[PDB]
Design a protein around this ligand. Structure first.
Ligand code: HEM
Length: 183
């Protein structure tokens, strides 16, 4: 993934747990040599998965829970490190934001030429609920998606109830979530 994802993970860990801990994770992740992540440069996806795995091993929480925290953090991080206006442009409610998300990543992808973005399709079941289809070229990021949804709930001051109803990792086609939301 592009370096800014890896910077966000370093930032979250460093902010929440201090620099010393970060270094132990980075070493455990096999990344001691990498002096710093370059935000606009592409890295092997392995780098990200290893950081998350090393974070779990060092701080002893399941990786799924790290991905959730990271997903939530990403909503603030992007808003604060150069993508505040882009986020604002994608709307001011959860269902509108989710409808715009593919176009938001198309916009990111004009700037990050090698981007492999997720794909999100909404099927609205009422004015306050939807089924969300999440398609990805990657494995294991559903929990990041749960955390991102919670991040968006906070951004829009909206209560978001999310339950995963289909799983990419089993045979099923792709991850699906049922979501209810209200203000
Ligand atoms: C705020 C709501 C957002 C959500 C819910 C979201 C969702 C996701 C998800 C689930 C992924 C994981 C990749 C995959 O599924 O294959 C991802 C990747 C990524 N997103 Fe977004 N995203 C959001 C906002 C943004 C913003 C504002 C940016 C601006 C930079 C951004 C840039 C990226 C980048 C660089 C990647 C890594 C993909 C790669 O390197 O190929 N995202 N996003």
């Amino acid at each position: 993934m592009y370096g800014l994802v890896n910077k966000a993970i370093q930032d979250m860990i460093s902010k929440h747990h201090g620099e010393d801990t970060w270094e132990a994770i980075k070493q455990k992740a096999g990344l001691e040599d990498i002096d710093f992540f370059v935000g606009m440069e592409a890295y092997s996806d392995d780098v990200t998965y290893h950081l998350v795995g090393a974070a779990s091993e060092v701080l002893g929480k399941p990786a799924e829970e790290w991905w959730i925290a990271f997903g939530e953090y990403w909503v603030t991080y992007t808003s604060e490190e150069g993508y505040g206006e882009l986020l604002a442009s994608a709307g001011d409610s959860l269902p509108e934001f989710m409808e715009n998300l593919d176009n938001l990543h198309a916009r990111v992808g004009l700037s990050f030429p090698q981007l492999r973005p997720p794909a999100f399709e909404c099927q609205h079941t009422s004015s306050k609920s939807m089924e969300l289809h999440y398609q990805s070229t990657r494995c294991g990021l559903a929990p990041m998606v749960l955390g991102l949804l919670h991040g968006l709930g906070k951004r829009f001051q909206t209560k978001v109830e999310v339950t995963q109803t289909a799983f990419r990792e089993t045979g099923e086609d792709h991850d699906i979530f049922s979501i209810k939301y209200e203000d």
